[PDB]
Amino acid sequence: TTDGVYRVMTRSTQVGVGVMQEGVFHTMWHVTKGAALRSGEGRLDPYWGDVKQDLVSYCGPWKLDAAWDGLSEVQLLAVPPGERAKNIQTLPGIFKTKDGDIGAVALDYPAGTSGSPILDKCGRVIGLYGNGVVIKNGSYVSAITQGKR
């Protein structure tokens, strides 16, 4: 119910993370594949999602609209399986694409951290962690994936 960051479990194992804001649960498509979720005794049903963006929202439309300003450091609020939530600050790089630049964080956390929020200095969620690339040395870089509100 409450706003905050949540683990997504399969009954049990943590397969991802998401954000509750304004009554809507936000995670990455690859975490749930649009399957329904349980929250206590209640059920959350998918409302909106997009495979190409790798995003899904439950119980309402996508609510997170803050954007990286292209200049400032950000914080990954990483929620790794089996570990407490922790903040890691970084200066994003960028994914240069044919459709514009996307901020990208060179931070490597396990599969089940997918959906962890990335924050600006005001604590607003500027996107979700966990859709990325592997560079030549094996290192990972995640897009700052944000939906449209």
């Binding site: 790798d54 790089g93 960028i94 990208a104």
Partner: protein, 38 residues
């Protein structure tokens, strides 16, 4: 069948560890949602 459990408040931490580089990478995004390096 999957379920959610609260893990924390969404806040910036003043003390936070700072790490990671800032790469500028040429990337493509396919219709399946996979990024790849060009």
């Amino acid at each position: 069948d999957m379920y959610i459990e609260r893990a924390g408040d969404i806040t910036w931490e003043k003390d936070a560890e700072v790490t990671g580089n800032s790469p500028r990478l040429d990337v493509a995004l396919d219709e399946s949602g996979d990024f790849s390096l060009v």
